[PDB]
Ligand binder design. Sequence first.
Ligand SMILES: CC(C)[C@H](C(=O)O)[C@@H](O)C(=O)O
Ligand SMILES: CC(C)[C@H](C(=O)O)[C@@H](O)C(=O)O
Ligand SMILES: [Mn+2]
Ligand SMILES: [Mn+2]
Lengths: 329, 329
Amino acid sequence: MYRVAVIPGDGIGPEVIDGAVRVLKAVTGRVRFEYYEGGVDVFQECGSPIREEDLEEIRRSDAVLFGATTTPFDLPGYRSLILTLRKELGLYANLRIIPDLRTGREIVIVRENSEGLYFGIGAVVNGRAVDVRLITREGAERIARFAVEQAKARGSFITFVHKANVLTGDKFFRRIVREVAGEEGVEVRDAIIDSFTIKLVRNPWEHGVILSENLFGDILSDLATVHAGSIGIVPSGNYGDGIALFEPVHGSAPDIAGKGIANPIGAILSGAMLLDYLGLDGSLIRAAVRGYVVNGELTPDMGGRARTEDVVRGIIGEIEDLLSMDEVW
Amino acid sequence: MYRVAVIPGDGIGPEVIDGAVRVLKAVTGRVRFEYYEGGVDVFQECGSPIREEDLEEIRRSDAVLFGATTTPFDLPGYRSLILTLRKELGLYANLRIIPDLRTGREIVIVRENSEGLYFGIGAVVNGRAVDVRLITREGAERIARFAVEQAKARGSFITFVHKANVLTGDKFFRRIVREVAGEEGVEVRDAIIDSFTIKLVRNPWEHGVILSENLFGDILSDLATVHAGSIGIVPSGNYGDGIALFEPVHGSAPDIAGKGIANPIGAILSGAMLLDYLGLDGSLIRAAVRGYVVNGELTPDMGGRARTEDVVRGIIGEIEDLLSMDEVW
Ligand SMILES: CC(C)[C@H](C(=O)O)[C@@H](O)C(=O)O
Ligand SMILES: CC(C)[C@H](C(=O)O)[C@@H](O)C(=O)O
Ligand SMILES: [Mn+2]
Ligand SMILES: [Mn+2]
């Protein structure tokens, strides 16, 4: 059996993760689920958003499934759970795939996930505050290589988005992405971060494998969800050299917490990416979702009257009708 | 007479500036125009994109009117003309106003223009490159004050866009904007930079006076031009304590250089903001533009068959019919 750590978190996190796990429990029985708490409640007990001993289990699990976590702005001392996990598990590649769920079309973003303006060097002294945007050869190379493999796997190219006209680190980053992509025969198109926002809303689907620094990727990936109906359909994988974590891009949405209306598709499809990463069958979850979308009613954030549970039951439905036959058929 | 330095630059810069100056020459004769060269040609002669002696004139002029400038990525040693001028003239406030030119509606952005990731501290050493995002008390305060005056003047509020969940400097910046806006009774709404891209495309007009760090402002302001028809209608002012510079947000577009199709409205309306700054009548240029838009044919970038000259002649037209009467009437 494969060993998967599950971190529902809070707000709507438990809701959409209930959905994604049930869907996973319906395409395979080769996965054992271990649940851990995390977020403010755990901070207030222990001074950390995750317990040291739990973190020790989690780093030895085969993969991680993560919901969402509320990070209150006005709580001093508190590190975001997800940033902690990203750093603790060496997760340097954030892959966000924004689907138009009528057509087959995708926006594919590779967000560097370990450095940039997230590297953690910051300070205030005497009315002068700084944050240090760090790009390292090793950081550049390995996210470049990750990106070329997503290009190749798709017979595509890389759009490297940057501000190398202003940022020394983006000049450096650019050399290295061109070097690795050349060494491997992949085309790299330049894009500048400000004008690329325009290209990204007007012309969504012509950009290949988009690659950028950590914070730029953060920004572009939220923006790209204008093209799916809602940020709530969009999944991600955070990959490192020995483990990966999967979470929906959406947040913990405590407004609609417990109202039973949250969109589980982001979590579900993030479950798909987790099966892929384990060498199991994510395609089934994807196909099950495309099929349910055709006629199925959606959640309010997408515009329908449907409850979370109707979407979940409906997709399991389509899955059951796929496992009813062999891989062939 | 008022003394205005003019820097057409290159590509379509001369074209759209010809238009904006003629329009200015048609609403007032109280302004003398002095022309200076700038950009790569001047770099190659002198090693600078602007001559020292010309810069000395320009810093003593009453205001600056600037077109656009090509900054080739593959030319070593070259500082962008506009970044140079921004820094040399102490221009710390970048105000970009994106109009929907049917309705009266505007997106109003105050981009901090002297620090942030533009402050200029960057280096590469041993496969480690950095850029330092600097926020200073003095930088925060004065862009905060500039922003409250745009709020008050409109009976509005500030939306402060940031990533203070990750960036120490944005935490600092936030304190200071809240302090000055409170001290002056202006509401400040928080917005986070990634989710604000979504709000900015779906819900453009409900954000008041948007304020952010330098690079965030760069990014948001290009994005906000999806709501005007084209980046080519959008003007800006770069303001400092003793001088200001006005330029269209668009770039030098060397593709359509000399084809006679470039949209002059961004430059023209930037001329409007320059008359305002001199205590002359920008409103006339604005009204002249709203009137010409109703039925007038536009340039290809907006979708019409019209040439640059037809737009320019047309707006002068509407201006002439405004100066035909007194201020009253
Ligand atoms: C919550 C925040 C720290 C996180 C990030 O900034 O990466 C989130 O916005 C996301 O995009 O995953
Ligand atoms: C050309 C570039 C240096 C400039 C900037 O980044 O500020 C431009 O993109 C703009 O927005 O004015
Ligand atoms: Mn984000
Ligand atoms: Mn820009």
